[PDB]
Symmetry: none
Subunit: 475 residues, 3 copies
């Protein structure tokens, strides 16, 4: 609750994060769980690779620990692996860096916790329900009695928004004005959109937070980028910077692939064995979280809009079905149900046609076939592909391509609403492919745009008196 | 798209059908599947009857083809069956007639496909979503460039409706004015309605398309039927025509009965073994598809109205109270749950409840009793809308009996609202009974009405300038 | 159908009750069942205690009637119990009083039947179905022919409402103006509300129907209560009356506690046995039925409003959930699904991973763990605005505290919206506690309010020309 002591963007961001992860205790536990998941993936994997004797486990009454090798031997068997030891050393260095960041992260969050309790007066018990609007009302009312900020200017409730969302408004405006290569023309497919978690991380590491970024303070643009002249040397410097960051990505490719290959397999293989159709459900597409997002919109407001409008969008995506597939389903159901009805009447009649060594199995198969076809056979209604279903999905999100409103029922509309709707299997595939795809897009497709990026940041960056250097659109 | 290359109706109907079966390819496949279903039913049945050695299959490790007899013997075993060979010859003649009609139909449908692509400019890809609306308005614009009709004003298409629906408006007006015997007074039941697929086929074969029908052209009524005189000789001729068509039906009775047998088996017996309650769901009743029809209404508009209004109608069939029972359920649940609670508290206390000769059986029977009663006990706070149910169903249908609106809750209303919405099982039964019932209704109940049918077709048949002879009501 | 034979209330109320219990035959049967439930509870209550030899039943093949003792001995064993014989004599006297009231009631309900059939012309078959408005539309039109009572007033169309609901409007206005102690401040809990069936019965027995009540006729207030003077002696007399009625309650406490014990114990426990979560569902309360009730509102209109608005209220009560647990669920699901995915991949790979010392149990326990966690994981995309919903509950209930509309999401709102909506189990507990709690509230908390009760009944009691003495608010 101190008198404007440390850079603001961070203080406010931390305050917001503490409100989101409902309370200090919850947040601390969440971070600890995040650290234990990494360590568990890595240690479980290195235990499966190195310590388990699969041959004895498989064939050659056996108790579970009959497989495992004693530690006095596991250490030697894992140590005589140069590749494994190297991956483990890099993994442990990343881990130690994350644990050290966590330490302070909590040493700096105890300060926000005391801020809440003593200056805002919202106990951690009343915080999951304290709500954002009131807190906003609390912080802005607190600004007076207790000194905070320069005091040159009193808070105005949009300052806090700019502080929390400075770099995110920049991402919104970058993606909105078609910088930042996302569209690609793949052979054998339409124009794909490839925007992942790692790619946006790299874009922010290149532009916003790094050793030689565009920003020096986290609230002020470096002095040269405001100058109209020397734009070409700045463009060359940015191009070289992004070249070398792309090369670091290309060199780290195997390790992130491993983790990506690994964590992912673990994450959904359970779900696959349970309900293989959970991966057929659709999610709201990182490109699409950035496209449908307003300028000064905190994460919880975007996500509230995005799930208020989720079931209309699933009703839309499921409303168009192939007639042909429908006809094939109907007739395959007829022929399979006919052969099965005959075989069922026989097994009912005598019961020794049952479990024909061949028949029983087919009966099931044929049963699987009839069930699949009946699932593909449409049932009555839901065929609208309506202007109206769109007319409600839009009412939620509020943005649509302008060539969508008329032809809501075509393959052009579905195909590029498809890109926003993101069925997950692809997400998981698209997050797997990002280690190997992000360096080459970063080296080839973005380096030509560096001279346009420089002109964006020079042209669209306003200095607002209290907040510093913010995007020009987010005003 | 040759100008006046044909009478308007056999062209417009085909165009409409091509829009419905979404595209030429789809339609072709659908027809092929329709031809393969007939051939499969007949060949599978004759294989089951004639080639399989059931004794070895049942009792006397055995592979499946150990049952089947070699073809060199199947041919002789199926050939030495006069009844089977005769049924197969009649079946093959009907099949060959259907295959020849199919070849002629696709040779005539390639012309409509070229019509679409070249004169309407709707590719087969944009046709499942082109929409009827698009083409119906569009052709009317084509009427200028690619001319049709020797002397044609741009098609209002109001007329075009007339072309597609000439004979169907006649059926609607026949059933609407209570010609065409449908109501019957069966002993042991109320007034049944018996209107099937075969019966309406026979009515149309008698009245509209045949060797000596009422119509000579498909768009013009024969010249004598417009004359007021000679009505009695025309009535006698129509009566003799329908007598002999009924006798043809009576002679073909065994074959159509056999057909309705096997197709259903395969079609339904599978569904019975899967979900015996799927046949308890209700369907919209061929009488009822003709009763709830609306002026000049293409099939897809009727079906859209009919399924928009399907779930309200199931909630209605579902809704009525049976109140006195409710009380019996409540109080039987009380007394049974009381005795069971005592016996349960005892078996929990000591666990030596058993050895009583009937105890355990008493607990099980009492549990069944409580569960049945609780199923009959209405759920509290379950809303009831008799007025609404007999209101929203009408809003979707738009036609109502004048004695339904007041007493929505009586057995008179349910009993005759049932016929319109009758359940699938009585549908399958009523389609089974039509081979044996259609000839006798056709001979006995319709031949007395021939003099009224003649007066209908003389009185209600207007000559509209562009379309020809249409029903007088459908104007 | 005669003229003014009985008090209008004693006629109109009966007419309304006959419409509610749909018909005379129903009403009778319901009353007979009500009489048989009392006698059945008391019977075994006494057969289980007195005639059954539990020792032989438990331990010392045995048929059920091997336990029971012969009647020649049951009579002596139940007769040599002074406490049991005394409870049975009091129970039999209450029963005989109820049976005599039942005979008198059906002898008076036949008259009413005849009223329906002959003067209203609504047969008992068309009654469950008559609908309320129609009777209203029938009785008021009948007032001309079979003249109604005095016939002083033609039907008011409100008069019937006042007649049926005279004392209930008084209860509504008493509870509405915070007479009638309901709120209590218990230690260890918030302000509890204790309003039961027995407490409201006692309030009505004290105020409305008794030997020395406020009312002498059932439609006229005693003459002294209209006088401004002598208010203090009337207050003292009312205080003494309620003191002695409270003392009668305190003396009858053991018997009502037992009966409360017996009648309740039997019913609910079995249900809990079946589904222990049925008692976690919530019901509207005697209170809350009196708080949310309009003035001249018949019981069926209140209950229609109350169940139209029941599911919104359950959605509200279930909306608040722990942030912390969620996190535990998510991460336990991760770790369990990870170990299970590994073990599943192994059992798929070789199939002999199974049959290992812990193999056929770890997979099952881990599957249960993942399923439990996934049930605790909230559905992502799940939209709950607690604040928004209360709006629909209000649209149905129609009454609310002012300080709810803003803070719909707080514990203050839930805590006192809890009182209106409390779950069954506290209902059954609160009906159990009323025998022992009603006398002390009646003696201590209401006797101080007697001088305010007298001033209420003097100030708010209007004489309306046709109906007599009605509450002043219910106008």
């Amino acid at each position: 609750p101190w008198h404007h002591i440390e850079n603001l963007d961070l203080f406010f961001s931390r305050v917001y994060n503490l409100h989101q992860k409902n309370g200090f205790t919850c947040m601390l536990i969440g971070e600890i769980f995040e650290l234990m998941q990494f360590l568990f993936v890595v240690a479980f994997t290195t235990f499966l690779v190195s310590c388990v004797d699969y041959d004895i486990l498989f064939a050659n009454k056996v108790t579970l620990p009959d497989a495992f090798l004693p530690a006095q031997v596991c250490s030697a068997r894992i140590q005589e692996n140069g590749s494994l030891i190297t991956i483990l050393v890099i993994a442990g260095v990343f881990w130690i860096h994350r644990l050290i960041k966590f330490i302070y992260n909590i040493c700096c969050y105890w300060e926000i916790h005391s801020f809440y309790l003593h200056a805002l007066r919202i106990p951690m018990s009343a915080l999951p329900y304290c709500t954002w609007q009131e807190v906003q009302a609390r912080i802005v009312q607190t600004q007076k009695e207790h000194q905070i900020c320069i005091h040159k200017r009193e808070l105005t409730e949009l300052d806090i928004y700019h502080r929390i969302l400075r770099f995110q408004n920049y991402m919104v405006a970058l993606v909105n004005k078609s910088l930042l290569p996302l569209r690609f023309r793949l052979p054998g497919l339409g124009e794909a959109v490839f925007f992942t978690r790692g790619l946006k991380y790299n874009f922010e590491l290149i532009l916003f937070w790094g050793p030689g970024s565009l920003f020096l303070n986290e609230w002020s643009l470096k002095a040269e980028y405001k100058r109209g002249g020397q734009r070409l040397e700045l463009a060359q410097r940015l191009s070289n910077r992004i070249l070398w960051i792309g090369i670091a990505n290309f060199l780290l490719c195997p390790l992130i692939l491993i983790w990506q290959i690994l964590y992912a397999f673990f994450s959904y293989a359970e779900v696959l064995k349970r309900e293989p159709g959970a991966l057929g459900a659709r999610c709201w597409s990182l490109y699409g979280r950035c496209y449908l997002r307003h300028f000064n919109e905190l994460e919880h407001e975007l996500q509230s809009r995005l799930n208020r409008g989720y079931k209309p969008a699933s009703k839309y995506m499921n409303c168009f079905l192939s007639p042909l597939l429908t006809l094939l389903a109907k007739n395959g159901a007829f022929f399979a149900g006919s052969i099965l009805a005959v075989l069922i009447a026989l097994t009912i009649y005598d019961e020794d046609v049952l479990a024909v060594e061949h028949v029983l199995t087919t009966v099931t198969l044929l049963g699987v076939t009839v069930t699949v076809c009946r699932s593909f056979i449409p049932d009555q209604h839901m065929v609208f592909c309506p202007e109206q279903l769109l007319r409600v999905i839009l009412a939620h999100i509020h943005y649509m391509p302008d060539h969508w409103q008329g032809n809501a029922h075509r393959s052009q509309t579905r195909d590029e609403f498809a890109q926003l709707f993101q069925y997950k299997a692809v997400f998981i595939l698209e997050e797997l492919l990002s280690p190997i795809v992000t360096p080459l897009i970063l080296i080839f497709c973005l380096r030509p745009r560096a001279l346009e990026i420089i002109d964006f940041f020079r042209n669209f960056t306003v200095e607002v008196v209290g907040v510093g250097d913010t995007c020009s659109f987010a005003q």
